[PDB]
Amino acid sequence: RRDWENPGVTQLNRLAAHPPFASWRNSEEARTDRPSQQLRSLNGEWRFAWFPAPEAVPESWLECDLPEADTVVVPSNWQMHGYDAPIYTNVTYPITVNPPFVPTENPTGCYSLTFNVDESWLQEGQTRIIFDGVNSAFHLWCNGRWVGYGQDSRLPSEFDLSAFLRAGENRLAVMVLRWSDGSYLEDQDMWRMSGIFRDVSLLHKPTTQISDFHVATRFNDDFSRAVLEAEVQMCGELRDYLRVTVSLWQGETQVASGTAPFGGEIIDERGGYADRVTLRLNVENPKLWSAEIPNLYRAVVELHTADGTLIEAEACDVGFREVRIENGLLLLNGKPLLIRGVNRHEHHPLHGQVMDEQTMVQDILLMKQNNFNAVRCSHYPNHPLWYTLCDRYGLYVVDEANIETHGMVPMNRLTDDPRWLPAMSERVTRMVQRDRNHPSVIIWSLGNESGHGANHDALYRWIKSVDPSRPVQYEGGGADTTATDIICPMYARVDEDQPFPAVPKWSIKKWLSLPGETRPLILCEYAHAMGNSLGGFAKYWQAFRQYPRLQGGFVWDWVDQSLIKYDENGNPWSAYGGDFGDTPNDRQFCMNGLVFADRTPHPALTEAKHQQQFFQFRLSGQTIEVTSEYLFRHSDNELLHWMVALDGKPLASGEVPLDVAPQGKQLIELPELPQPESAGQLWLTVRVVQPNATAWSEAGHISAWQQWRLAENLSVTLPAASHAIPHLTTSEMDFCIELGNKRWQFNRQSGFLSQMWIGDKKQLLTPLRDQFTRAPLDNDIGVSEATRIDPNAWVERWKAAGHYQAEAALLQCTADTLADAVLITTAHAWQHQGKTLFISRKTYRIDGSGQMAITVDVEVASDTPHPARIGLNCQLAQVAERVNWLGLGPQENYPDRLTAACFDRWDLPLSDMYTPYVFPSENGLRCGTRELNYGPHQWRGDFQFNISRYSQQQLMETSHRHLLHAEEGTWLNIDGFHMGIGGDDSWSPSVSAEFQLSAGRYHYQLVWCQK
Amino acid sequence: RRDWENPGVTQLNRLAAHPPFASWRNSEEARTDRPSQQLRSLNGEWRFAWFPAPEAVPESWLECDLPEADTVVVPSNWQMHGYDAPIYTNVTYPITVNPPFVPTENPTGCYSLTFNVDESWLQEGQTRIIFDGVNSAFHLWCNGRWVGYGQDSRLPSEFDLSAFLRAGENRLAVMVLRWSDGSYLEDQDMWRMSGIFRDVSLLHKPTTQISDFHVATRFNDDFSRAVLEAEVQMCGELRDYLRVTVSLWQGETQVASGTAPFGGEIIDERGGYADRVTLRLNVENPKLWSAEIPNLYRAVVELHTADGTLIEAEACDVGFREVRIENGLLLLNGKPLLIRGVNRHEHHPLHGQVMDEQTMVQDILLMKQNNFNAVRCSHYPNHPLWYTLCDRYGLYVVDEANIETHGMVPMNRLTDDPRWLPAMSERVTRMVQRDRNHPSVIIWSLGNESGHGANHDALYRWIKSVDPSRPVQYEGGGADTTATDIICPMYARVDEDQPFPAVPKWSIKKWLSLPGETRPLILCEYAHAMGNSLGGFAKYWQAFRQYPRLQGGFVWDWVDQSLIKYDENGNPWSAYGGDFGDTPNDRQFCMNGLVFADRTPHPALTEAKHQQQFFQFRLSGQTIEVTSEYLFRHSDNELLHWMVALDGKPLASGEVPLDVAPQGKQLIELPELPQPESAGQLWLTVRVVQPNATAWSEAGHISAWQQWRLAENLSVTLPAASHAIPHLTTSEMDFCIELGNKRWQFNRQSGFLSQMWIGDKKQLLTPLRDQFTRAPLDNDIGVSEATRIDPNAWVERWKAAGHYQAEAALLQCTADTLADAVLITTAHAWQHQGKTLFISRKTYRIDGSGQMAITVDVEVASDTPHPARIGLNCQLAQVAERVNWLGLGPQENYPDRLTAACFDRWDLPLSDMYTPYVFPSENGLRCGTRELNYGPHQWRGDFQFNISRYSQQQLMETSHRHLLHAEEGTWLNIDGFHMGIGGDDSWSPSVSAEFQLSAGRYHYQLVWCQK
Ligand SMILES: [Mg+2]
Ligand SMILES: [Mg+2]
Ligand SMILES: [Mg+2]
Ligand SMILES: [Mg+2]
Ligand SMILES: [Mg+2]
Ligand SMILES: [Mg+2]
Ligand SMILES: [Mg+2]
Ligand SMILES: [Mg+2]
Ligand code: NA
Ligand code: NA
Ligand code: NA
Ligand code: NA
Ligand code: NA
Ligand code: NA
Ligand code: NA
Ligand code: NA
Ligand code: NA
Ligand code: NA
């Protein structure tokens, strides 16, 4: 039958979908969510053999273990065990496009398990097997007899095994196909793996049983009264003595309870559902659920007889909340949300796509700690425990059907085809049936990047009909089609329109007001965090706060999908597309997260944390105004710490309790601040600190901060004049300057400072030279590739202009003596093929104090692409342990990504001054720096810098961080100006005009001296 | 695999659905709709064998003919060949409800055909087979190899046989299952049959071919300009030299033509459809299509190469018309429709469910001739030719998906379940793909009596999304759900509410105005024409004309589903439910048509024709005002004929040409009305005659009529002194009266006229006695059954009250002689269980003229159910050839169904005075009669009467007309009053209060005399 090449067959003998069951036979266990003896895990060691096609599988395997099989753990992805390669392709399908067919060489994983079944499970009732995730399709046999088949790699497939098992040992055999017609609906941008990658379990239910239950909560106008409505369905034999009891508990207190026999109200001319009953429980003053305060109740559903014997119980956590769109705004409990979201794939660097509770918890704690309140399941239903953690920890969730056909041409070729409606329908309906009782899900999504086809419209309506409690969104076809209640673009920019034909991405501000438009706008994806990125993040947040109908967005994305590989020496390294021999592949495009695959943060996460703060601040005088962005809670776990420092020197500080209602303000007046000792800039830093631990944070967690400049007393005191004057020695080759223990050498043929000495120690490994390029970031490169150059990418523009190849031509090099110093003046031209790109004019003034003041004035031809940076660089001979500076920090920060950084005095080990992005590039810059100290050296001025053991040339020549090698000494890059890093997207230029170095003429000044 | 017990498998290897194709290889043949050499019929003689279950089919059958098979004609329903019995069940499924399973005993029809295939069809191109209709599911093999499987008995299933055929002789094998999971979606109220019942054909297409085409017509505001847009899709290898030309013809004139290479506009980020192209042709002053003037153009779509070589051509008739709902009104070409519709099942009394062109044309003509302008395909897509005929003759059509699950409990059990969404979706999507180019289809329907489930909502939106040109309707779930653009109830009454829980049927006038309601209302079924019915039809038409938003309805239904059976002598008779041994069955409920199975009309058809007239008239003095209800045409084929008669005697007449614009009025002044010379009532009758023949009627066709009373001159002339005086002979047991050669005898113990003689000839077989009951109509019976009485039905109320058992008790019988007459006075009480139900007091006055004047005064107890009639009856000794009367006629008419009858002098053969309803009952009445003549007798008065060879007793005791036998003499029923017949529905009391005999006291008088 080749059922795996027929979209008309997505399953055979599979049971209906339904919310999470456990068939407790003790009600108290159900109340507390304790393990159920009726729900057993079959996870652990199984037998597995790999074959190249289903045709190669031997018949013997159905009845007997293959001697050649290996023993492996399940769940797992077989690529993670080395049986074949995982493939990283973004848009292009990994298989030839020829629906509904798949390749004849189709990797097949033959899994089997011998396991015991107690006779008690078989004497009465039904025993079913549940496979929570099998990628991408499979057949199942039990004790050699075929049971059924299933597709949709991201929802559970359940089969009744009652008539196939026997007391004692039994053997299951599962043949899993890597590719199937379901693969045409699974083209998400992620590694392509396969296997039994989610839990496998066995569930026993009585013959008369709860087969489905739906929980709804509806409220009065002020949310002070609710009615909990629980519709319960049974399968099995109806009898007048059956009853359903639904009880609701808040902790250990029972809030309400109702009992009824089965028999629903009349629905139509034929009657009602004799096999269903709806219980309605009044709840006064319910404690409401939100991501701010995830209050939960427990609904316990008992099926029992009138005389009181329990048959079984099921149950769920219940969050009383209403979600609705009114007057153009998405409201939660009547108040407008501000979504601080992130897209999150299920990815683990060692386990592939298998998820575990520890990793789930770690992700949610980091998310909450970084001020996220929402997550989008990009792009498929997740492992079931995810929803339970979001309900309990408190995160809003977008639950999304496992439908993506991005590689089709045009993209809606399948979604507008009715023959594909059935298969798509089950991906949407099975998801709603399974997850509709979770309060954390607040919005349903129809899938991702599958264009806009009529199947979408049909499905959108089906959901609207079966569950009116949550909005439906879908971005395909232009983000504002008739299949979405929310305008949900991906990568639309704040102010800049991208008027692509048919599916333009308008500026978000403009989009809201197009003629006739009235829906809320929440980006389904924005701020693509690939590599050194998140440039322009603050521009989205300023817009979200100013426009009511801009209600936020989901950043793309949480974690890099890098996989671990081992080198010849056994040492692990982070790999990306193409590193497994996979081709074609999309190389580093699989790494776009705020965090590395092991959960270590990238520097961008701090930027997100700051912009997503829940407290806003203004300063007038010495009065700090604190405004709360919480909608529901008072600031009952927060105090404000304030500190004033002079040039990094602490002058004073205090603490004040914060007591701010949701949406309210608090005014705090600072104390009189005595006058500072000397000249400099006073800076005020305030932080919101939570003194008590929460379920998601430690005592002392800092949730928000902000700084302002206070008074400045510019320095007017003349410097203590030199007890000595430097001496110049002129030679045909060089100009040398000597001052005590110091010596400076300027090469006359190159016009650069080629050497410096302290005592008898040389300080430089490479001379001090102008630098106008950077090792290109992912955002500078975009989709450009050696074999398919994208001439529009910044990297290509610079390359084509000769920026990386330009040679300095000396125009002038002279020396003069002044009354107290020596003055060296140079001028160089950087040219390429005859064109002068940049002119650098400098003066170096060395005085009796030993200080060398460098003044730089650069001209940049108006018609050359604006350069990545304007600065100097050199390789110092020394390697020191610490980097100390007065400037923005402590983490890496760039012009268009520096809001989270604070101006203060920071000191870190040198290695923290390098950010190990998997794909190496310019990194580690710190901006707004007035003093930098390293080894015996100090530089002062107003510049940006980076310092590390890797030169820019090395970073640009190296594709994987594991291949980098520390160079001799230390590379210092000191910039007067640096271009923004961008990131609205990583496939087109995204650096906004205000962060491009287009001024034509630039000036900067540095003082270099000893420490 | 048992694919026929799995709603997840509705087909295997079936090709996509598409509009009618013929693969012409000459464009002019395509233009002219001539027969195509590439489309062959395989209809004719096939081999067939019946089996009790698919398991019983011998494997030998795949490879070769079974010797036991018979040779039979295809298309056919195997029940009509006598292989098994057809079943008539209305709501209750004919199989146990245990979805998706079917009985193990499942009648299987094995059909096979040996036929030739030309090598030219195989050497290039694709040869497919098309089964237009297979009930209910089937497997297909070709030359012993399995091809595919299909479900949905009402849409074509097609399969590519290219790789299975060989030049020369080939053999097809088709195993047809009577029952399948598809049957759960085919519970329509009609005979349950099976087989290959619609056409089987072979279609040859080139490898590079037109695979689909959609034609749309949009207009400017006054319809003076149109844009024809034709989207064309291809299959095969794309090549830059390919082209599509679409040309539009109006008769022989080429109106427009456009050509383009393939390549549609960009649709989304991935591009557009390289395999499609859209041609747009401008049309100025298009001739618009409507049921009034079905103007059609012809669109020819040619697939060819750039040098002009034709590859193939497809084509369709195009009707320029726009259908839209605006401000609560259904508009066609901007004018609000008034639907004069009827539901029509595909039924032939001899061939079952097989349709032929002659029967379809016969139906179409009679419909048009009877002023119908629309038809609803109750309840499945029809044979393809039906739409061609509607497009060309001009009828608005409601095309309805084959989905009816009436027998489920509750009704939406399957339609609300997502697991049945796929199967249902195909029944809707495939109908749309097939019929969307037909102009006659103006509204899509989601099926019938399947409750309201979310699957309906999903499919309603799918339609609206793919074809915005036609509204979508669906009655299930209360008739005004979110799945319907039109409020379309079935059997909702005009003024009376039927507030059933959950799905009330409101009075239609009230429904329109319920709070918040704004849609138009068109009944999908009304005026159930079962048996002697159509009572109150005029009430619906008065309301549709008074209320703009009441836009008409579809009467239930066109033709009785009776089947022919043959008695011992081979004579045919009409059979209904249970007559084939089918049980359970719903007896006569399958006969609800305006016409009998053979197309002979029932009397109700004339009432429908009159109320659905397109001309309305008013009279004011000598002025007749004619108003046209046509929306688009002028009365260019009509003249008004008028006639004035005095009591039936013609006084004057004339004709005036009609020249009225659509919706306009014309005033016609009648000439001076010379006075009449005699007492009597003058009556004016007018008729609209079409002088010229049309495609649907003959010259002389009468399309409308109306009558009015004009002056009346009451008779004040004293008769004249009688030549003689009757004599009274009194005896112990009788009062006899003699006058000339006539004698009357009144029995003194019974109190009735027991005998009357002309000479020595007795004139009565039974005495003249009062009668208060009638042989019950289907509407009087409803669903009541001897085995399950419905105490609320009229017949049961009458029975229970003793109406049929009450016996006359004499209260008084006296005789007096007057100056010139003898007077007999009598009084009788009718009692039951000691209660007096009725009292009848009469006088018989016999005078010198020989006339007997009868006065009747009756009392009816207030607490007894209102009686069916208040009259007298007798069995006359003689039988005469003709019946002549001055009253309403000529056809049968009842109080609530007499608008179409006209007052005049009529004369018919006695048998025309009996209506042969298959299920016999009271029939043949004529009301408003002032004089009745039969043999030598004459009765004068103001009464209603029926006259025939069958007593009411026999009619009520006989269930099939074929078993009635003429009694001796003639039974005459003369009524002073008769109850209405009702018909709003035939399962609950439906006679309106104003037509019930509830006055308590009634008076009538008659004169019987010799002629
Ligand atoms: Mg499949
Ligand atoms: Mg226990
Ligand atoms: Mg054993
Ligand atoms: Mg994608
Ligand atoms: Mg700030
Ligand atoms: Mg099936
Ligand atoms: Mg029905
Ligand atoms: Mg009339
Ligand atoms: Na906002
Ligand atoms: Na590549
Ligand atoms: Na990516
Ligand atoms: Na606080
Ligand atoms: Na690099
Ligand atoms: Na109307
Ligand atoms: Na019956
Ligand atoms: Na019927
Ligand atoms: Na005329
Ligand atoms: Na009868």
UniProtKB/Swiss-Prot annotation, chains A, B:
Binding residues for Na(+), per the UniProt record?
Answer: 189, 589, 592
Substituting residue 987 to F/G/L/T results in: Decreases affinity for substrate
A GO molecular-function annotation: identical protein binding
Specify whether Transmembrane is a keyword of the entry. no
Q: Which residues are responsible for catalysis?
A: 449 (proton donor), 525 (nucleophile)
- Describe what upregulates or represses it: By allolactose.
Q: Where does substrate bind?
A: 90, 189, 449, 525-528, 592, 987
Q: What class of enzyme is it?
A: hydrolase
* Outcome recorded upon mutating residue 525 to Q: 10000-fold decrease in the beta-galactosidase activity
Q: For binding Mg(2+) 1, which residues are annotated in this chain's numbering?
A: 404, 406, 449
Co-factor binding details: Binds 2 magnesium ions per monomer. Can also use manganese.
The record lists the effect of residue 345 to D/F/L/N as: Less stable to heat than wild-type. Causes significant destabilizations of the first transition state
* Site feature: Important for ensuring that an appropriate proportion of lactose is converted to allolactose: 987
Which effect does the record note for changing residue 449 to H? Slowly inactivates galactosidase activity by reducing the binding of magnesium. It increases binding specificity
- Residues annotated for Mg(2+) 2 binding in this entry: 585
Which family does the record assign? Belongs to the glycosyl hydrolase 2 family.
Protein known as? Beta-galactosidase
Source organism per entry reads: Escherichia coli (strain K12)
Primary gene name:
lacZ
